[PDB]
Coordinates of N, CA and C in Angstrom, one line a residue:
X18 N 84.7 88.6 119.3 CA 84.8 89.4 118.0 C 83.2 89.6 117.2
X19 N 83.3 90.5 116.5 CA 81.9 90.7 115.4 C 82.0 89.8 114.6
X20 N 81.0 89.0 114.1 CA 80.8 88.2 112.9 C 79.7 88.6 112.1
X21 N 79.4 89.9 112.2 CA 78.0 90.3 111.5 C 78.9 90.6 109.8
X22 N 78.2 90.3 108.9 CA 78.4 90.6 107.4 C 78.6 91.9 107.3
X23 N 79.6 92.2 106.4 CA 79.7 93.9 106.1 C 80.2 94.0 105.0
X24 N 79.7 95.0 104.3 CA 80.2 95.5 102.8 C 79.7 94.3 101.8
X25 N 78.4 94.1 102.1 CA 77.1 94.3 101.2 C 77.3 94.3 99.8
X26 N 76.5 94.6 99.3 CA 75.9 94.8 98.0 C 76.7 95.9 97.5
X27 N 78.1 95.9 97.4 CA 79.0 97.1 97.2 C 78.8 97.6 95.7
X28 N 78.9 96.7 94.6 CA 78.5 97.1 93.3 C 76.8 97.8 93.1
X29 N 75.7 97.0 93.9 CA 74.8 97.6 93.5 C 74.5 99.1 94.2
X30 N 75.0 99.3 95.2 CA 75.0 100.7 95.8 C 75.7 101.7 94.9
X31 N 76.9 101.3 94.6 CA 77.5 102.2 93.7 C 76.7 102.4 92.5
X32 N 76.3 101.5 91.8 CA 75.2 101.6 90.7 C 74.1 102.7 90.9
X33 N 73.5 102.3 92.2 CA 72.6 103.3 92.7 C 72.8 104.6 92.5
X34 N 74.1 105.0 93.0 CA 74.5 106.6 93.1 C 74.9 106.6 91.8
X35 N 75.5 106.0 90.7 CA 75.6 106.3 89.3 C 74.3 106.7 88.6
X36 N 73.2 106.0 88.9 CA 71.9 106.1 88.4 C 71.5 107.5 88.4
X37 N 71.6 108.0 89.9 CA 71.2 109.3 90.1 C 72.2 110.4 89.6
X38 N 73.4 110.2 89.5 CA 74.3 111.2 89.1 C 75.0 110.8 87.6
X39 N 74.7 109.9 86.9 CA 75.3 110.0 85.6 C 75.2 111.2 84.8
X40 N 76.0 111.8 84.1 CA 75.8 113.0 83.3 C 76.0 114.3 84.2
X41 N 76.1 114.2 85.5 CA 76.5 115.6 85.9 C 77.9 116.1 85.6
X42 N 77.8 117.3 85.2 CA 79.0 118.1 84.8 C 80.0 118.2 85.6
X43 N 81.3 118.3 85.1 CA 82.6 118.5 86.1 C 82.6 120.0 86.2
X44 N 83.0 119.9 87.6 CA 83.1 121.4 88.2 C 84.2 121.2 89.1
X45 N 85.3 121.8 89.0 CA 86.2 121.9 90.2 C 85.9 122.5 91.3
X46 N 86.0 121.7 92.5 CA 85.3 121.8 94.0 C 83.9 122.0 93.9
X47 N 83.2 121.2 93.0 CA 81.6 121.4 93.2 C 81.3 119.9 94.0
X48 N 80.2 120.1 94.4 CA 79.6 119.0 95.4 C 78.2 118.9 95.1
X49 N 77.5 119.3 94.0 CA 76.1 119.1 93.8 C 76.0 118.7 92.4
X50 N 74.8 118.3 92.2 CA 74.0 117.9 90.9 C 74.3 119.2 90.0
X51 N 74.7 120.3 90.1 CA 75.0 121.4 89.1 C 76.3 121.1 88.8
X52 N 77.2 120.3 89.4 CA 78.2 120.2 89.0 C 79.4 119.4 90.1
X53 N 80.3 118.4 90.0 CA 81.1 117.7 90.9 C 82.4 117.3 90.1
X54 N 83.4 117.4 91.1 CA 84.7 116.8 90.3 C 85.0 115.4 91.0
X55 N 86.2 115.1 90.5 CA 86.2 113.7 90.6 C 86.4 112.9 92.3
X56 N 87.1 113.8 92.9 CA 87.3 113.4 94.4 C 86.0 113.9 95.2
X57 N 85.2 115.0 94.8 CA 83.9 115.1 95.3 C 83.0 114.1 95.2
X58 N 83.0 113.6 93.8 CA 82.1 112.5 93.4 C 82.2 111.2 94.2
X59 N 83.6 110.9 94.5 CA 84.0 109.7 95.3 C 83.5 110.1 96.8
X60 N 84.0 111.3 97.4 CA 83.3 111.4 98.7 C 81.9 111.7 98.9
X61 N 81.1 112.1 97.7 CA 79.5 112.0 98.0 C 79.3 110.4 98.2
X62 N 79.7 109.9 97.1 CA 79.4 108.2 96.9 C 79.8 107.5 98.2
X63 N 80.9 107.5 98.9 CA 81.2 106.9 100.0 C 80.3 107.4 101.3
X64 N 79.8 108.8 101.4 CA 79.1 109.1 102.4 C 77.8 108.5 102.3
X65 N 77.1 108.8 101.1 CA 75.6 108.2 100.7 C 75.6 107.1 100.7
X66 N 76.3 106.1 100.3 CA 76.0 104.7 100.1 C 76.8 103.9 101.2
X67 N 78.0 104.4 101.9 CA 78.5 103.6 102.8 C 78.8 104.3 104.3
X68 N 78.2 105.4 104.2 CA 78.5 106.3 105.6 C 79.8 106.4 106.1
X69 N 80.7 106.5 105.1 CA 82.2 106.8 105.3 C 82.5 108.2 105.1
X70 N 83.4 109.0 105.9 CA 83.6 110.2 105.7 C 84.9 110.4 105.0
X71 N 85.1 110.9 103.9 CA 86.3 110.8 103.1 C 86.4 112.3 102.7
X72 N 87.7 112.7 102.6 CA 88.0 114.3 102.3 C 87.9 114.3 100.7
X73 N 87.5 115.7 100.4 CA 87.5 116.0 98.9 C 88.6 116.5 98.4
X74 N 89.6 115.5 98.2 CA 90.8 115.7 97.8 C 91.4 114.3 97.3
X75 N 91.8 114.4 95.9 CA 92.6 113.1 95.4 C 93.9 112.9 96.0
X76 N 94.4 114.0 96.5 CA 95.9 114.0 97.1 C 95.8 113.3 98.7
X77 N 94.5 113.3 99.4 CA 94.2 112.8 100.7 C 93.9 111.5 100.4
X78 N 92.8 111.4 99.4 CA 92.2 110.0 99.2 C 93.3 108.9 98.8
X79 N 94.3 109.3 98.0 CA 95.4 108.5 98.0 C 96.2 107.9 99.3
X80 N 96.0 108.5 100.3 CA 96.5 108.2 101.7 C 95.8 107.1 102.3
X81 N 94.2 106.9 101.9 CA 93.3 106.0 102.7 C 93.8 104.6 102.7
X82 N 92.9 104.1 103.6 CA 93.0 102.4 103.3 C 94.3 101.8 103.0
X83 N 94.3 100.8 102.5 CA 95.6 100.1 102.1 C 95.7 99.9 100.6
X84 N 97.0 99.9 100.3 CA 97.2 100.0 98.6 C 96.9 98.6 98.2
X85 N 96.7 98.5 96.8 CA 96.2 97.2 96.3 C 96.8 97.1 94.8
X86 N 97.1 95.9 94.7 CA 97.9 95.9 93.4 C 96.7 95.9 92.1
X87 N 97.3 96.4 91.1 CA 96.3 96.7 90.0 C 95.5 95.3 89.5
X88 N 96.1 93.9 89.7 CA 95.8 92.6 89.4 C 94.8 92.4 90.5
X89 N 94.6 92.9 91.6 CA 94.0 92.4 92.7 C 92.7 93.2 93.1
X90 N 92.2 94.3 92.2 CA 91.2 95.1 92.3 C 89.9 94.6 92.5
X91 N 89.2 95.0 93.5 CA 87.8 94.5 93.7 C 87.0 95.8 93.6
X92 N 85.7 95.6 93.5 CA 84.4 96.3 93.4 C 84.6 97.5 94.7
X93 N 84.5 98.7 94.6 CA 84.5 99.7 95.7 C 86.0 100.3 95.9
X94 N 87.2 99.6 95.1 CA 88.4 100.3 95.5 C 88.5 101.5 94.8
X95 N 89.4 102.6 95.2 CA 89.8 103.8 94.6 C 90.7 103.4 93.7
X96 N 90.6 103.9 92.2 CA 91.6 103.9 91.2 C 92.1 105.2 91.1
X97 N 93.4 105.6 91.0 CA 94.0 107.0 90.9 C 94.8 106.8 89.6
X98 N 94.8 108.1 89.0 CA 95.2 108.1 87.6 C 96.3 109.3 87.6
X99 N 97.3 109.3 87.0 CA 98.1 110.6 86.8 C 97.8 111.1 85.4
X100 N 96.7 112.0 85.7 CA 95.8 112.3 84.4 C 95.4 113.9 84.6
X101 N 95.6 114.4 83.6 CA 95.0 115.8 83.6 C 96.3 117.0 84.1
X102 N 95.7 118.2 84.3 CA 96.5 119.3 84.6 C 97.5 119.0 85.7
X103 N 96.9 118.5 86.8 CA 97.7 118.3 88.0 C 98.2 116.8 88.2
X104 N 97.8 116.0 87.3 CA 98.4 114.7 87.4 C 97.4 114.0 88.6
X105 N 96.3 114.2 88.9 CA 95.6 113.7 89.8 C 94.3 113.3 89.6
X106 N 93.6 112.2 89.3 CA 92.4 112.1 89.2 C 91.9 110.5 89.8
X107 N 90.6 110.5 90.3 CA 90.4 109.3 91.1 C 88.9 108.9 90.3
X108 N 88.9 107.8 90.5 CA 87.4 107.1 90.3 C 87.1 105.8 91.3
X109 N 86.2 105.1 91.2 CA 85.9 103.8 91.9 C 85.6 102.6 91.0
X110 N 86.4 101.7 91.0 CA 86.2 100.6 90.4 C 84.9 99.9 90.8
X111 N 84.7 99.4 89.6 CA 83.0 98.8 89.4 C 83.1 97.2 89.0
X112 N 84.3 96.7 88.9 CA 84.5 95.4 88.2 C 84.5 95.2 87.0
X113 N 85.0 94.1 86.3 CA 85.1 93.9 84.7 C 85.8 95.0 84.0
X114 N 86.7 95.4 84.9 CA 87.7 96.3 84.2 C 87.3 97.8 83.8
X115 N 85.9 98.3 84.6 CA 85.4 99.3 84.7 C 85.2 100.1 85.7
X116 N 85.2 101.5 85.6 CA 85.4 102.6 86.7 C 84.3 103.5 86.6
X117 N 83.8 104.1 87.6 CA 82.9 105.5 87.7 C 83.8 106.6 88.3
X118 N 83.6 107.8 87.4 CA 84.3 108.8 88.0 C 83.6 110.1 87.2
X119 N 83.7 111.0 88.3 CA 83.3 112.6 87.4 C 84.7 112.9 86.6
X120 N 84.3 112.6 85.0 CA 85.3 113.1 84.2 C 85.5 114.5 83.7
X121 N 86.3 114.8 83.5 CA 86.6 116.2 82.8 C 85.7 116.4 81.5
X122 N 85.9 115.2 80.5 CA 85.3 115.4 79.2 C 83.9 115.2 79.1
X123 N 83.5 114.2 79.9 CA 81.8 113.7 79.9 C 80.9 114.0 81.1
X124 N 81.7 114.5 82.2 CA 81.0 114.2 83.7 C 81.1 113.1 84.1
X125 N 80.0 112.9 85.1 CA 80.0 111.5 85.5 C 79.9 110.4 84.8
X126 N 80.5 109.2 84.6 CA 80.5 108.3 83.6 C 81.1 107.1 84.0
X127 N 80.8 106.2 83.0 CA 81.7 104.8 83.4 C 82.6 104.6 82.4
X128 N 83.9 104.4 82.6 CA 85.1 104.1 81.7 C 85.6 102.7 81.9
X129 N 86.3 102.5 80.9 CA 86.9 101.3 80.7 C 88.4 101.6 81.4
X130 N 89.0 100.6 82.3 CA 90.3 100.7 82.4 C 91.3 100.3 81.4
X131 N 90.8 99.7 80.2 CA 91.6 99.5 79.0 C 91.4 100.5 78.1
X132 N 90.7 101.5 78.2 CA 90.9 102.7 77.4 C 92.1 103.2 77.1
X133 N 92.9 103.4 76.0 CA 94.2 103.7 75.9 C 94.6 104.9 77.2
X134 N 93.9 105.9 76.8 CA 94.3 106.9 77.9 C 94.3 106.7 79.4
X135 N 93.4 106.0 79.7 CA 93.6 105.4 81.2 C 94.3 104.4 81.4
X136 N 94.4 103.7 80.6 CA 95.5 102.4 80.9 C 96.9 103.0 80.9
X137 N 97.2 103.9 80.0 CA 98.5 104.6 80.3 C 98.9 105.4 81.5
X138 N 97.8 105.8 81.9 CA 97.9 106.8 83.2 C 97.7 106.3 84.3
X139 N 97.0 105.1 84.7 CA 96.8 104.3 85.9 C 98.1 104.2 86.8
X140 N 97.8 104.7 88.1 CA 99.1 104.7 88.9 C 99.0 103.8 90.0
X141 N 97.8 103.7 90.9 CA 97.7 103.0 92.1 C 96.2 102.7 92.6
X142 N 95.9 102.0 93.4 CA 94.6 102.0 94.1 C 94.6 101.6 95.6
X143 N 93.5 102.1 95.8 CA 93.2 102.1 97.6 C 92.1 101.1 98.0
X144 N 92.2 100.4 98.9 CA 90.9 99.9 99.4 C 90.5 100.3 100.6
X145 N 89.4 100.9 100.8 CA 88.7 101.6 101.7 C 87.7 100.5 102.5
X146 N 86.9 99.7 101.6 CA 86.0 99.0 102.5 C 86.6 97.4 102.9
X147 N 86.5 97.0 103.9 CA 87.1 95.8 104.4 C 86.3 94.7 103.7

């Protein structure tokens, strides 16, 4: 079998994407720097940094990969929250109890998993990178 190293500087690649996208406003169904949503930001990040094709849907991203327990989160895992009007919101865990996401209140931003709003609404996590 293959013994090539894989999955790489995951944190630095996500931070590269964040550097270029920080502050981009929230727009439902958007996919550009003029405006992007939470699942769209996850889709773009995984395409551009990891070469993986994800759907632009929190509902479908919840099905991906394998489930991870909250205690076992690793950088690059998708974090899912029962938040907002439809009860669906996704971000990318970046370690140290932080996650990056396209937020409705602030656009693309880094938030803490311990912020009371997000801590109360955390639902599940998915691992996509082996």
